[PDB]
Amino acid sequence: ALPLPHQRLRLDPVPEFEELQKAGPLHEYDTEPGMDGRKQWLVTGHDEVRAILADHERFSSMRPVDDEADRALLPGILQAYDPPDHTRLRRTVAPAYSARRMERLRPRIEEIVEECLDDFESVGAPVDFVRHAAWPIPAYIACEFLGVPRDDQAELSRMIRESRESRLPRQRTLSGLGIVNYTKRLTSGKRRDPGDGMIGVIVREHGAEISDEELAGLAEGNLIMAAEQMAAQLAVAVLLLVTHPDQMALLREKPELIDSATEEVLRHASIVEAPAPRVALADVRMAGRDIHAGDVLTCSMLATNRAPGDRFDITREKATHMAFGHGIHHCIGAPLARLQLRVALPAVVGRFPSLRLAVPEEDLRFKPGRPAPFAVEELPLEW
Numbered sequence: 001a002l003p004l005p006h007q008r009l010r011l012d013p014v015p016e017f018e019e020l021q022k023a024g025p026l027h028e029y030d031t032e033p034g035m036d037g038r039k040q041w042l043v044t045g046h047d048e049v050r051a052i053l054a055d056h057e058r059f060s061s062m063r064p065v066d067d068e069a070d071r072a073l074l075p076g077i078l079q080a081y082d083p084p085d086h087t088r089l090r091r092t093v094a095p096a097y098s099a100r101r102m103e104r105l106r107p108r109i110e111e112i113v114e115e116c117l118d119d120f121e122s123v124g125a126p127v128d129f130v131r132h133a134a135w136p137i138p139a140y141i142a143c144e145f146l147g148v149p150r151d152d153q154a155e156l157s158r159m160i161r162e163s164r165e166s167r168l169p170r171q172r173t174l175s176g177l178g179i180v181n182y183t184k185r186l187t188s189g190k191r192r193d194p195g196d197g198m199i200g201v202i203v204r205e206h207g208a209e210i211s212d213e214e215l216a217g218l219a220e221g222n223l224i225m226a227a228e229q230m231a232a233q234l235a236v237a238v239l240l241l242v243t244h245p246d247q248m249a250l251l252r253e254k255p256e257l258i259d260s261a262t263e264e265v266l267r268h269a270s271i272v273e274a275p276a277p278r279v280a281l282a283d284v285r286m287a288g289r290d291i292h293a294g295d296v297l298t299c300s301m302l303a304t305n306r307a308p309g310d311r312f313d314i315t316r317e318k319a320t321h322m323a324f325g326h327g328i329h330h331c332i333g334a335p336l337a338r339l340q341l342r343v344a345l346p347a348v349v350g351r352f353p354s355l356r357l358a359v360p361e362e363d364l365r366f367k368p369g370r371p372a373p374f375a376v377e378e379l380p381l382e383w
């Protein structure tokens with residue numbers, strides 16, 4: 001029974017949710033299941049969402065649990081920590097995402113794209129864009145980013161894809177363990193020998209600052225996140241271009257619109273519809289409502305990034321979106337995400353000027369964004 005902040009008509013929010021938004025910025029709405037020991041709050045007002053995420057000190061990211069020390073600790077997963085642990089751990093990883101270090105990666109990303117678009121083009125049209133382009137590209141990039149040996153990348157990417165979208169649970173569980181197990185070896189092997197990866201730079205700069213188990217969970221986490229998020233962001237960006245062919249040719253010619261378009265696909269997709277629920281540590285007054293210590297708030301990225309009447313417009317100037325969230329948890333991988341879109345969208349458009357949907361729009365299936373990211377299951381294309 002999908003909550004209102006995760007319901008969509010295709011890519012757009014639903015009329016009932018946009019109607020709820022009109023009543024105010026804050027709502028008595030149960031988004032999370034379980035409870036009702038704790039009061040539920042749904043946050044829809046833009047300023048109010050910004051304010052909660054910036055106020056980590058009174059709003060924690062840790063999971064609301066009956067007793068502490070009866071929660072899964074989740075080593076290496078940045079969005080599950082609070083300061084100071086998080087302040088500590090964020091500082092550890094941050095170097096790997098420097099503007100400098102990304103620029104080094106740019107050429108290998110360019111290559112990965114061309115190589116994947118050749119394989120995509122290799123199969124005759126129609127081709128599913130989700131399986132032969134949207135998954136492999138970020139998957140491979142995630143492996144190069146992790147310093148995964150070339151001859152392993154193929155297999156490891158299969159497991160990443162399969163652990164996230166297989167119809168069968170056992171297969172999901174199997175591929176799931178393969179990645180945990182592969183990541184452990186690689187992390188300890190990189191402790192011995194710090195190399196090209198992001199595991200390498202973390203050891204060479206903040207080796208002692210991080211425990212072995214916090215490397216392994218981080219590495220795995222960053223690997224899966226990088227892949228699945230970008231698979232969804234890319235597929236949706238392409239779907240949006242393909243169903244606005246003028247907008248496409250407009251970026252085709254005039255390549256400099258890429259940054260502007262990059263923001264617009266982030267805003268419009270908003271593949272992350274809500275960030276981790278926030279838990280009140282103190283009593284707080286906000287927007288005429290009293291929030292008590294127990295209460296759990298769901299921030300709606302969908303309420304903030306979207307409005308009734310939205311048009312996909314890559315020429316939008318004032319993207320004030322929070323697709324990457326806000327505050328200390330603000331996506332640490334945003335520079336990689338933006339780099340990928342900036343490399344990838346020009347390449348597809350510049351290669352397939354007549355890139356076209358091969359089935360009717362109504363035949364498209366969408367993965368709900370309530371678990372993980374919002375996505376298209378399949379994107380059949382011809383050119």
Ligand code: HEM
Pocket residue numbers: 061078079080090222225226227229230233270271272275276323324325326328329330331332333334336337
């Ligand atoms: C592609 C589009 C992406 C979107 C829309 C997105 C969205 C987000 C959001 C909204 C958060 C905040 C979570 C919260 O406050 O509860 C977040 C955090 C995070 N993201 Fe992303 N992300 C994207 C890509 C990526 C990529 C490629 C990576 C890997 C490099 C990544 C790694 C992370 C990590 C490690 C965090 C936790 C950071 C922290 O808690 O301080 N994301 N992301």
